[PDB]
Amino acid sequence: IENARKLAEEQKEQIVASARAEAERVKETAKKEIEREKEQAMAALREQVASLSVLIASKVIXXXXXXXXXXXXXXXXX
Amino acid sequence: KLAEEQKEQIVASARAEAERVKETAKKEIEREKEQAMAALREQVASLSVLIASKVIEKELTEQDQRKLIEAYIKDVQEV
Amino acid sequence: MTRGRVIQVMGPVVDVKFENGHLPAIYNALKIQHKARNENEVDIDLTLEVALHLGDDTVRTIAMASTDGLIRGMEVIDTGAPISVPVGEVTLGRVFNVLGEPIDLEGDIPADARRDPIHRPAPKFEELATEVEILETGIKVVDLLAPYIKGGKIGLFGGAGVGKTVLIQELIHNIAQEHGGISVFAGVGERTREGNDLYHEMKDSGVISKTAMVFGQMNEPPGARMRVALTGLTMAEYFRDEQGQDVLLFIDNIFRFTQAGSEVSALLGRMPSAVGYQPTLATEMGQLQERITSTAKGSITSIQAIYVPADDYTDPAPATTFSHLDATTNLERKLAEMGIYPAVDPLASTSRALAPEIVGEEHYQVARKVQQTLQRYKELQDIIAILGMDELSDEDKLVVHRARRIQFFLSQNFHVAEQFTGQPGSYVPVKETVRGFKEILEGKYDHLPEDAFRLVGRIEEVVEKAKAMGV
Amino acid sequence: AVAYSARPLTDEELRALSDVFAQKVGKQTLEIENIIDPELIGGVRLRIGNRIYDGSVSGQLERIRRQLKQQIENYESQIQVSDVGTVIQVGDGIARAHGLDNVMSGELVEFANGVMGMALNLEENNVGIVILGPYTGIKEGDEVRRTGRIMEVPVGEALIGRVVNPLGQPVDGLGPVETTETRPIESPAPGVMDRRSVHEPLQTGIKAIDALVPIGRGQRELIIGDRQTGKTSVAIDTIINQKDQNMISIYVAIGQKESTVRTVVETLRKHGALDYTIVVTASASQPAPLLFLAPYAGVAMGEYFMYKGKHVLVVYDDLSKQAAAYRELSLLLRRPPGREAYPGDIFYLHSRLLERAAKLSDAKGGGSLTALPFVETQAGDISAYIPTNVISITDGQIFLQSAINAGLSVSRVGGAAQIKAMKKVAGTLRLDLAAYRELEAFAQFGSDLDKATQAKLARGARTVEVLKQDLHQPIPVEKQVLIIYALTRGFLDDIPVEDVRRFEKEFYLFLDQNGQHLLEHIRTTKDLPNEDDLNKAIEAFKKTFVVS
Numbered sequence A: 001i002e003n004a005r006k007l008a009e010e011q012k013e014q015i016v017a018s019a020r021a022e023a024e025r026v027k028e029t030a031k032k033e034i035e036r037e038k039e040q041a042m043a044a045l046r047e048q049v050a051s052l053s054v055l056i057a058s059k060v061i062x063x064x065x066x067x068x069x070x071x072x073x074x075x076x077x078x
Numbered sequence B: 001k002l003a004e005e006q007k008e009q010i011v012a013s014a015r016a017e018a019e020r021v022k023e024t025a026k027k028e029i030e031r032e033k034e035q036a037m038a039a040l041r042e043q044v045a046s047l048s049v050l051i052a053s054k055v056i057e058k059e060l061t062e063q064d065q066r067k068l069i070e071a072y073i074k075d076v077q078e079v
Numbered sequence C: 001m002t003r004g005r006v007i008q009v010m011g012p013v014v015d016v017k018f019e020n021g022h023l024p025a026i027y028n029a030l031k032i033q034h035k036a037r038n039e040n041e042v043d044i045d046l047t048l049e050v051a052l053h054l055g056d057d058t059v060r061t062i063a064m065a066s067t068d069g070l071i072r073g074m075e076v077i078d079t080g081a082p083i084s085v086p087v088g089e090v091t092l093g094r095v096f097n098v099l100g101e102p103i104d105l106e107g108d109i110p111a112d113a114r115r116d117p118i119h120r121p122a123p124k125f126e127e128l129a130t131e132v133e134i135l136e137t138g139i140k141v142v143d144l145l146a147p148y149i150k151g152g153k154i155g156l157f158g159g160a161g162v163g164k165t166v167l168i169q170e171l172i173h174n175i176a177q178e179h180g181g182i183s184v185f186a187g188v189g190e191r192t193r194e195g196n197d198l199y200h201e202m203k204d205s206g207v208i209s210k211t212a213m214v215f216g217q218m219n220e221p222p223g224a225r226m227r228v229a230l231t232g233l234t235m236a237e238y239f240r241d242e243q244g245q246d247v248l249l250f251i252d253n254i255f256r257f258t259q260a261g262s263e264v265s266a267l268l269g270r271m272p273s274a275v276g277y278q279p280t281l282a283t284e285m286g287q288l289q290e291r292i293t294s295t296a297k298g299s300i301t302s303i304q305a306i307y308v309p310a311d312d313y314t315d316p317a318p319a320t321t322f323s324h325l326d327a328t329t330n331l332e333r334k335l336a337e338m339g340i341y342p343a344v345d346p347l348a349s350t351s352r353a354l355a356p357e358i359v360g361e362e363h364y365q366v367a368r369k370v371q372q373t374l375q376r377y378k379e380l381q382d383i384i385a386i387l388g389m390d391e392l393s394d395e396d397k398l399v400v401h402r403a404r405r406i407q408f409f410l411s412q413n414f415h416v417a418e419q420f421t422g423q424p425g426s427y428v429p430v431k432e433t434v435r436g437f438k439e440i441l442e443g444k445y446d447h448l449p450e451d452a453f454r455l456v457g458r459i460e461e462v463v464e465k466a467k468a469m470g471v
Numbered sequence D: 001a002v003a004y005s006a007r008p009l010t011d012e013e014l015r016a017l018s019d020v021f022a023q024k025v026g027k028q029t030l031e032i033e034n035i036i037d038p039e040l041i042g043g044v045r046l047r048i049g050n051r052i053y054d055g056s057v058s059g060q061l062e063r064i065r066r067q068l069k070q071q072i073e074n075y076e077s078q079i080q081v082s083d084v085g086t087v088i089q090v091g092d093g094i095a096r097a098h099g100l101d102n103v104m105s106g107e108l109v110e111f112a113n114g115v116m117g118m119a120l121n122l123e124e125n126n127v128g129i130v131i132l133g134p135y136t137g138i139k140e141g142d143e144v145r146r147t148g149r150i151m152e153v154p155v156g157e158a159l160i161g162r163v164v165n166p167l168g169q170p171v172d173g174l175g176p177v178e179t180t181e182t183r184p185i186e187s188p189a190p191g192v193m194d195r196r197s198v199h200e201p202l203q204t205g206i207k208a209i210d211a212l213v214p215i216g217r218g219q220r221e222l223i224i225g226d227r228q229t230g231k232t233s234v235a236i237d238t239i240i241n242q243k244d245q246n247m248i249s250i251y252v253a254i255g256q257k258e259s260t261v262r263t264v265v266e267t268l269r270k271h272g273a274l275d276y277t278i279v280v281t282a283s284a285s286q287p288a289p290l291l292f293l294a295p296y297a298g299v300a301m302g303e304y305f306m307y308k309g310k311h312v313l314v315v316y317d318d319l320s321k322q323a324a325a326y327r328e329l330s331l332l333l334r335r336p337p338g339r340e341a342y343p344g345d346i347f348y349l350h351s352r353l354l355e356r357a358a359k360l361s362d363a364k365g366g367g368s369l370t371a372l373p374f375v376e377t378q379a380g381d382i383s384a385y386i387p388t389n390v391i392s393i394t395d396g397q398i399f400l401q402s403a404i405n406a407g408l409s410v411s412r413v414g415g416a417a418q419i420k421a422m423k424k425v426a427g428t429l430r431l432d433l434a435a436y437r438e439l440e441a442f443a444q445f446g447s448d449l450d451k452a453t454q455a456k457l458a459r460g461a462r463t464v465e466v467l468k469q470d471l472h473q474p475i476p477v478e479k480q481v482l483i484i485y486a487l488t489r490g491f492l493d494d495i496p497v498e499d500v501r502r503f504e505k506e507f508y509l510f511l512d513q514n515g516q517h518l519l520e521h522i523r524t525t526k527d528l529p530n531e532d533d534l535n536k537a538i539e540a541f542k543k544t545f546v547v548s
């Protein structure tokens, strides 16, 4: 009885450890994927943010002003 | 009999705990993704604010003076 | 066309500024009625009672409800009189607020009914009537050692959770039907579920249609808990002084009135007295308690329950209220912890009607002997505690033997306590109580076990209970 | 009357604006003292009296405020106005400000730092403010503005399974809470003609409470004892036991240690009790103003469910720490102290809170709200100030001994809040417990007749061994009543007192195996099953039992 309970507890603990380790591995893969997506979206949505910034300034207040604003944003980033 | 039933109960409880841990990890990943999207939006908003400020500074204020006077009169009427 | 303005708001206390030579008198009632002007405002419907004149056309008033939402600058209206309350036959069988508005959702009292002011002076020396008659309650420890008067003031002192409410309900059940007159119940600073239970119990029993109720309870601001006893007092005074009737008056806890006064006086700007109380404790207590009297027209029998903070009987409030009572009843936690119910202390409870010419000659001797044996037993507690019962003389052992039996026979089973224990409840007339204690003092029942005396009505029931116990 | 503008405005425009504002405000004439502040390049910001009209630069910052088509093309910018004041005093957690003309009593104000406060006293030329947060960022000369709302908390079903602080800000780090409703912290209680008597049981799962001190839905019961008597364990077991019952639980921790709060939340999450629980926390390092609003925030969160027809249960982990925080706050305002230095309205502070628990009538919906306040004593003194203050508010008490003390623990409403099956068997158990309790007082060393030697001692010892329990293992009412019925009917009298716990465990196993009809009859009828069948089952178990 005690031996069977100990075996069941050991198997349960091993299963829990395996599940936690698999979750950690999935978390590492998800973190890497999220970082790569964050960088790519940072570039793309930074271009989009420059365009939307030109649009927002115009709304609060064409192509040449947008190009000048893009150059200014690039200079600020640099 | 009873010992095997207790073993099965322990196994079921461990399985439920593992499933809860898996759900918590999935929710943590979703929360991380949501926070990353929010941070990207915040960075985009800050860049938009900076670029809009620069553009508005570059814009001519000769008509902006009259626009500000008109907006002040409108706000006076509204309030 | 005379208006005030709010100047300060500090909790339950407000300050109002008026025009020159247009100030309201003390105790007047003022009204605020405000409708929101924008989204940063709420709606206000409030009444205030004038308390002080501070100079510079400013008065300081006490609020009857919550002051949240008040804005410095809102205008106030002077009614021209104190709080006025409806009186007469229109208030019999109804439940009321502090301001006199019904809260039982059965309709609205017409605006043309006669109304009386809350504040008035006491009756003078040339109008009271002095005489002592005895009121029967059916309680052994009350009938024997501290009988009630038929036209006086009765007090029930108690700590927390010792049995004030159960005793109040038992007395209501026994007396209010036998009275056959009018009764008023005022509840100040008590549990709301208790009032909800009592209303339905009265409606089932049928004591309603000759009762009026007023409720200001635990959740209300201090200004409301201060001036609720005065509303029931006015309602009873109408009957006494206009129809020459005999009126009963119950007050659920008279301590809350002084406690609310103490809470207000701090914000009114007064230097505190001992234990932090207000300087005007005795004056307010006397101003309330001197209107509850029996004049030449009618009488007002008032039964009041008084709370004792931290089980300290020397606190300023119980000590001050002790002086207005004709019969008192003190409940102790030590007796309740032993299972004795009710927990009346047989030596500290007094009555002015315990005289040989009022109750009789046998009653007086029986009560005095019982008290003497209880005091003698009380004197021997320490030496029994340390040494034991083996180092006593024969007379002392006899004293203890009879004292335990007497102390257990002072308990009883009540009608309203049936839902707790199960016993139906008992009622004992005076003569039976005197007879039973006379037999106990004579050593007639010295052989029965001491446990057969607990929670019975009469002494024949003691004999039956001993018989069923195998002896 | 001072304007901030990017460029010096023309005198004619200044005159026109001054005349317009003179006409609007209500003054015959007005003069503006324009400034040359160049930071505000968007437009003009006016400050007259204690009112401000914003320019256009703030709109860009308002753009960040509109973080949230494409923001409706930056949405639209409007001239937002606000009423302001300035601080003139700050220290020990209480401020004091000028301005704020049209402020209300009990309103919420916001400091320039970001912290919030209450408007407490509106004096002639002053406002007293209580700071709900860290006060080391507020200095004299700072700016404070109104919000236009009486104090309130966010309420809804989005709060279920979250840990928040008395203002509704999450502290577990799982993200924002998406609610859409609010409720005022100070609200009136249900009236006399809105309630009804309590007639439903609340099952804690503990035999001693469920049999001797029953609790009903809509009651107010007090749990009182010394420190190190373990009342948090009672609270956690009661909260865990409500898994099947349709109940919503709220746990409020006042003045506790944040580490123990962390471990309690971990214990709750293990047993799956976070699907119906809200946790409100204010630890020992937080300001006294925050330690004093937590019970009111909890009750405000509970009343949202209560006034919809649902049933709620609220736990206040210590009222004796709320009392000390309120005494500290009121002594800093220089108010005359009373007994034990407590203020005069320390009774009102607790009576106004515990009177919001009620069993509503059927015209109001039929909801309920149960309350379980905690009070901690010193050396078991039940006649102190605060313990007697709270004993006179509730409907009973449960005194834990440093093990329920049945000589001081009582329940008024309970008794009608019990099922018939337990009501039939509780009386005998109470009498046996009393018999042992008084017998042992003198019979420690003394011979007795066989009656008092066995029937008055062995039965009591067996019932005292039965009443014990273990942590985080609540018991269903059917099993509870079956074991109590067996003990009161007379079995176990030939079982050694060292084997009763194992007897009970094996009896539960036998029941779960081959007592389905008994259990279903109890669960469906709320009455005892047939006595002959019960005796037959108990005899079969006794025959199969291996007495050691």
Ligand SMILES: Nc1ncnc2c1ncn2[C@@H]1O[C@H](COP(=O)(O)OP(=O)(O)O)[C@@H](O)[C@H]1O
Pocket (backbone or CB within 6 Å): C158, C159, C160, C161, C162, C163, C164, C165, C166, C167, C341, C342, C414, C417, C420, D392, D410, D411, D412
């Ligand atoms: N006459 C009585 N007989 C039996 N029990 C009583 C009696 N009076 C009070 N009790 C006990 O006291 C409890 C109620 O106390 P209560 O009267 O409400 O306290 P308070 O003094 O605050 O009104 C009940 O649970 C009951 O067990």
Ligand SMILES: [Mg+2]
Pocket (backbone or CB within 6 Å): C164, C165, C190, C252, C253, C305
């Ligand atoms: Mg009372």
Ligand SMILES: [Mg+2]
Pocket (backbone or CB within 6 Å): D231, D232, D317, D318, D374
């Ligand atoms: Mg605790």
